[PDB]
Amino acid sequence: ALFVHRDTPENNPETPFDFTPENYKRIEAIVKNYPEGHKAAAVLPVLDLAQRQNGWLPISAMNKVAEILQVPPMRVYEVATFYTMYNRKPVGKYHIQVCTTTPCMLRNSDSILEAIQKKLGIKVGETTPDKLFTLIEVECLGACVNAPMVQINDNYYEDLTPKDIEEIIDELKAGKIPKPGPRSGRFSCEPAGGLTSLTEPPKGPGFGVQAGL
Amino acid sequence: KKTSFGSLKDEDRIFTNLYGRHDWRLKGAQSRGDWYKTKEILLKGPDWILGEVKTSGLRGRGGAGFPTGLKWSFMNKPSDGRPKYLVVNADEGEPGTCKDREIIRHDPHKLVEGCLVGGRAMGARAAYIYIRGEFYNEASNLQVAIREAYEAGLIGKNACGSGYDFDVFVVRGAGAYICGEETALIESIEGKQGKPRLKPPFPADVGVFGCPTTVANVETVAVSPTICRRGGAWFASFGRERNSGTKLFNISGHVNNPCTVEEEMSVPLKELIEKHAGGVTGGWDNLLAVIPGGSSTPLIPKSVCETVLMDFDALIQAQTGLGTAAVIVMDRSTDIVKAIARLIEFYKHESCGQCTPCREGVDWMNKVMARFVRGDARPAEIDSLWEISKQIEGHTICALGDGAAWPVQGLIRHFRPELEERMQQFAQQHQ
Amino acid sequence: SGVNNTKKWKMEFDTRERWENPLMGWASTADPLSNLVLTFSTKEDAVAFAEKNGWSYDVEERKVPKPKSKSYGANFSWNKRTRVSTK
Numbered sequence: 001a002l003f004v005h006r007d008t009p010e011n012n013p014e015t016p017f018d019f020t021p022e023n024y025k026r027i028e029a030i031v032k033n034y035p036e037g038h039k040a041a042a043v044l045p046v047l048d049l050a051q052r053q054n055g056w057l058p059i060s061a062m063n064k065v066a067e068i069l070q071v072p073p074m075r076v077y078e079v080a081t082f083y084t085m086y087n088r089k090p091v092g093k094y095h096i097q098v099c100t101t102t103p104c105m106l107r108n109s110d111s112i113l114e115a116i117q118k119k120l121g122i123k124v125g126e127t128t129p130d131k132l133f134t135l136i137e138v139e140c141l142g143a144c145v146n147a148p149m150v151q152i153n154d155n156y157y158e159d160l161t162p163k164d165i166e167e168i169i170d171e172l173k174a175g176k177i178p179k180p181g182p183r184s185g186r187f188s189c190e191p192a193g194g195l196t197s198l199t200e201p202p203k204g205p206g207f208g209v210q211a212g213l
Numbered sequence: 214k215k216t217s218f219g220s221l222k223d224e225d226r227i228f229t230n231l232y233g234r235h236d237w238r239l240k241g242a243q244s245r246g247d248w249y250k251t252k253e254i255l256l257k258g259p260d261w262i263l264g265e266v267k268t269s270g271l272r273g274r275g276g277a278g279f280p281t282g283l284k285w286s287f288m289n290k291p292s293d294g295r296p297k298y299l300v301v302n303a304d305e306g307e308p309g310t311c312k313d314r315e316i317i318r319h320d321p322h323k324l325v326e327g328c329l330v331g332g333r334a335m336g337a338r339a340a341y342i343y344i345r346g347e348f349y350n351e352a353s354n355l356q357v358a359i360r361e362a363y364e365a366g367l368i369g370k371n372a373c374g375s376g377y378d379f380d381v382f383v384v385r386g387a388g389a390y391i392c393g394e395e396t397a398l399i400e401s402i403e404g405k406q407g408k409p410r411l412k413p414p415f416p417a418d419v420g421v422f423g424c425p426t427t428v429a430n431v432e433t434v435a436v437s438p439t440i441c442r443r444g445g446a447w448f449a450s451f452g453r454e455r456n457s458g459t460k461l462f463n464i465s466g467h468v469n470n471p472c473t474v475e476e477e478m479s480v481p482l483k484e485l486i487e488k489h490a491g492g493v494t495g496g497w498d499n500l501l502a503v504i505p506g507g508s509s510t511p512l513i514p515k516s517v518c519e520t521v522l523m524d525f526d527a528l529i530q531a532q533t534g535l536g537t538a539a540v541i542v543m544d545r546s547t548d549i550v551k552a553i554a555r556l557i558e559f560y561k562h563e564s565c566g567q568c569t570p571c572r573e574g575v576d577w578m579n580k581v582m583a584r585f586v587r588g589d590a591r592p593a594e595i596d597s598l599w600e601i602s603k604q605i606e607g608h609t610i611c612a613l614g615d616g617a618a619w620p621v622q623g624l625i626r627h628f629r630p631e632l633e634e635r636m637q638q639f640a641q642q643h644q
Numbered sequence: 645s646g647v648n649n650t651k652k653w654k655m656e657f658d659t660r661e662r663w664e665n666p667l668m669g670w671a672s673t674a675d676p677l678s679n680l681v682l683t684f685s686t687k688e689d690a691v692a693f694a695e696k697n698g699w700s701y702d703v704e705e706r707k708v709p710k711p712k713s714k715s716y717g718a719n720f721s722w723n724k725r726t727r728v729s730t731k
């Protein structure tokens with residue numbers, strides 16, 4: 001949680017990083033999404049792309065994005081430090097992110113947090129000795145009605161109990177990819193126990209259209 | 214005139230795929246009425262489209278509730294040489310709020326179609342959709358829908374065979390609640406830190422890339438095509454006066470069945486919890502307080518929840534606000550002080566740090582509230598904390614400063630005895 | 645940034661030698677006017693005072709900051725170089 005950089009043998013400007021030939025085509029499409037003369041609009045999507053290729057952003061990765069977009073490196077450093085999804089230190093293959101804000105806290109996200117620590121042996125903010133998992137608390141992830149929930153990489157696992165999250169870690173330890181979504185008896189955001197709305201068949205094209213188009 | 218609101222019929226619901234029980238892709242959406250006669254809507258002009266939104270009584274669904282038709286007409290002017298843009302706010306960051314997520318992943322083609330129709334009304338050449346980076350799978354669904362609309366000629370060159378050119382772009386956030394603020398969203402798209410701009414200039418004059426821009430919420434944008442097809446008068450037949458239409462609700466917290474559901478504006482809050490969420494955990498009499506419109510709104514006690522309606526004006530008179538209409542329910546076993554303190558901690562973690570009253574004040578209120586939880590304070594600090602929150606409120610660049618002050622004020626307003634009692638417990642334990 | 649010390653005219657005299665006191669190294673002077681500073685409402689009042697006392701004087705014209713054109717909105721220019729890269 002430090003917002004200054006000190007060069008180290010594994011994180012310094014000479015640390016080797018470059019985009020793959022395939023990722024240079026993705027960058028070209030990202031840049032074209034914005035008006036000519038405002039290529040700096042691509043800083044966030046391109047840093048995120050470098051994170052997806054590399055897993056985290058060394059100072060050399062930030063220096064590379066600055067060069068490609070012809071932006072001052074400091075302005076890239078500002079974006080990397082500002083936004084919390086950018087990892088300026090390496091994290092485990094699975095970055096577990098437990099929501100602890102009030103709506104999730106009311107559904108006992110403390111129990112979910114405690115279960116992950118007990119199973120993995122680590123604390124919040126730490127990485128397992130084998131570098132497979134990293135654990136952190138995060139703010140609301142926009143899945144409040146499906147609380148308690150966690151995000152592991154790009155997937156939401158929702159409506160968790162201590163048993164559910166423990167199974168998910170087990171499936172991940174075996175290389176498997178658990179299905180995202182609620183682990184309770186429902187599919188998404190609907191009320192548990194049967195729908196209280198949207199039980200008719202939807203009306204098709206043209207229903208209820210005012211005259212005169 | 215109507216007098217009691219609620220019991221919304223399935224035939225009058227806009228987001229008819231809210232739960233994802235039907236195909237969310239183009240084929241399903243078209244069969245449910247999306248993308249129908251969009252060409253006819255576009256050819257009626259921007260003045261006609263803006264007229265239907267004005268008559269519908271639609272108000273912003275992002276939290277501030279500005280009249281949508283009046284706001285969108287700010288961009289109804291001639292070009293001065295610059296391009297004009299529509300930015301759709303899919304940041305969806307307010308704690309308790311998860312409605313915008315269901316539209317993006319289950320009803321993507323209503324958002325895409327709303328971008329075109331809403332974009333036409335503003336004369337915009339393209340729409341940038343800002344979706345928070347945590348919504349990777351929902352962002353991917355939205356891109357697939359956009360490609361389908363492109364491959365069918367619905368958007369892009371000669372959209373819907375209308376002679377109008379429109380591009381829809383999806384840009385992902387990188388983890389920041391502040392980027393849901395309309396000007397902080399623009400600064401993020403431009404590649405900077407998500408730091409709000411002062412106003413003036415207003416976005417309709419100098420916006421994204423310094424061009425005329427309108428920032429609209431996902432739900433606000435995603436209901437306009439239906440408002441145009443079915444007419445604004447139909448939309449205005451729901452809810453009270455100046456609170457028109459249908460509204461998505463998130464009920465979370467201590468309810469039997471947390472859920473997202475569509476319902477009529479001005480529905481009683483008690484009816485919404487009982488009918489759709491299965492009641493308060495342990496019976497209605499176990500209710501302690503409700504945060505009715507997201508963490509930014511003040512809480513209200515059970516004595517006010519009995520009769521309060523869910524609309525902009527009814528909740529304002531209850532000294533709160535509809536906000537995003539995200540209901541957080543706290544039953545009688547909640548530690549109310551801790552729950553509010555966790556909200557101030559969230560605002561402390563989300564402040565952009567740009568301006569003094571929030572950069573310093575919110576952090577200050579977080580430290581005070583952490584002590585209030587333990588009782589490690591004096592009763593005289595309660596009035597100091599109230600005064601501190603009033604120095605933050607109305608003095609900051611954006612509304613995140615206000616949104617951190619209000620939950621504190623709601624707590625002191627309705628639960629001062631619980632604050633004073635806890636301090637007295639702590640004092641006797643350490644004597 | 646305060647400007648409240650640029651309101652009134654001043655009269656000062658030419659600086660003369662200061663040397664180090666041999667005992668203590670303090671700054672000694674032989675100039676009775678070394679600390680004399682006079683305040684005036686206007687330049688004419690100061691010049692009138694200097695003439696009747698018989699002092700040769702130099703008058704420096706007041707420097708008022710030039711008015712500036714400030715535009716917050718210019719920070720976000722569509723096509724001009726005033727667009728800022730950070731806030």
Ligand SMILES: Cc1cc2nc3c(=O)[nH]c(=O)nc-3n(C[C@H](O)[C@H](O)[C@H](O)COP(=O)(O)O)c2cc1C
Pocket residue numbers: 272273274275276277278279281302303304305306307390391392393394395396428429430431433434611612613616
């Ligand atoms: C801290 C903060 C976060 C916000 N987050 C969102 C958001 O996630 N989604 C949204 O639609 N509006 C959000 N807003 C409100 C927007 O600033 C703006 O009012 C809204 O997008 C306008 O669209 P509307 O008129 O359709 O409601 C936020 C405001 C603040 C101060």
Ligand code: SF4
Pocket residue numbers: 391408409563564565566567568569571572609610611612613614615
């Ligand atoms: S109120 Fe807070 S979030 Fe808003 S501009 Fe000021 S410091 Fe940033």
Ligand code: FES
Pocket residue numbers: 099100101102103104105139140141142143144147149308309310
């Ligand atoms: S409070 Fe956890 S997803 Fe919203």
